[PDB]
Amino acid sequence: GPHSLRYFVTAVSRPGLGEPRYMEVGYVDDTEFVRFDSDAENPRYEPRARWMEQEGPEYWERETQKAKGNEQSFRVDLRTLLGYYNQSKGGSHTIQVISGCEVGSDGRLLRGYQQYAYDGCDYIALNEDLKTWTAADMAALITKHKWEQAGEAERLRAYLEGTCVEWLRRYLKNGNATLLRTDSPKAHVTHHSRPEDKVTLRCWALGFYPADITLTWQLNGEELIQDMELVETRPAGDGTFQKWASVVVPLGKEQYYTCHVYHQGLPEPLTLRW
Amino acid sequence: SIIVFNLL
C-alpha cells in the first residue's frame, strides 16, 4: 500500500515573552511518531510511539541537534517575514511547514511536499514537478527568486526522492506491525422523543481505529442526505475514535429506518435497527 | 528524519 512520512513544523513568536516557540512533529501514515518541542523542559526529540524506541541514542541526539538548528533558523524567518510584509513589530505571528513524502508500493516516491504558511495562509510551496515554486503573493516571490538562485528545489528533490523515503522504509520496518492496528466499531442506536411529534434516532460508532468511518441512515433503501446531522468524528482519548449520526423521525415509524456503519475493520458494513 | 531548512 502507499505510505507517507511527513513533518509538521510550527514556529510562533511572542513579542516580549521571549524566544519564539518552536515545534517539529513527525507522522508516518498520519500517526504521530516523533516530537520535538522547545517549551518542554529539556528540549529533545522524543518518541511518540513505542516502536520508535528501538532507535539508538545517536538517532535521538542527531535529531535533537538538527531540531535546535532548525529552531535557530525559524526565529530569523519570523523576523524576515515581518520586514517583507512591513508589519508592526508588536504582534504574534506563525510560520508552519509541511514537509515529507508519500511513497507507493514499489517504494518509489509519488508525492513530495515542501509547503510554507505564514499566519495561517499559504506562503510558498514546492510544486509537484519538484523543480519550481508557487509563491502566494509579492512577499513570497522574494523567497522564490532567492531559492531559485540557491538551487533550493534541487536540494529538496534530492531529499525527497532519497533521504526521505529511505528513512521512511527504515521506520516502516519498525512500526509496520503496529501501524496496521485496526479496531472495529461498536455500534448501537439511541432513541430520543422530541417535542412534540418527533423521535430522534442517533447512531453511535465507538472504539474504532483508524478514524476513517462512514455512517448513513436509510429510509427503506434510500440514503437520507438531509434531515441527517453528523458530528466530526472525535477522539475518545484512548486511541480509539467516536462518531455519531442521527435524524428525526415521526412516531411509531422507526422500524422503517436503518443505520449503516462503514469501516475497514468490519468484514461487512454494519446494519442496525431500533 | 527531517530536512535542515533554509532561510526565507
Partner: protein, 90 residues
Amino acid sequence: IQKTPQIQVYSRHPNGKPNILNCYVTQFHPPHIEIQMGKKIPKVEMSDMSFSKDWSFYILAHTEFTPTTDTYACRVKHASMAEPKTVYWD
C-alpha cells in the same frame, strides 16, 4: 487571518462510572488558546498541540470525572471571539 474554534464536549464512555470527559477543539488559528472546563474543575490534562493540512490547529483536553444532577462546563478563550464561548453537554 483569524478562525473560530469548533468545540465538542462529550464523554469517553456512555451516572457513576470511570468516565473521562473531553473537550476537543479544532479549526482554529492563531494557536494560542485557553480552555477551561459543580463548576470550574482542576487537574485538566491537555494533549500536545498539532495542526492539519489546512493549517488549522487542534487539541484535546480531558479531566476525569464522575457524573450523576451536576452540570459540567467548557469555556475557551481565543482571539477570534470577543468573549469566551462556553459549552455544556448531552
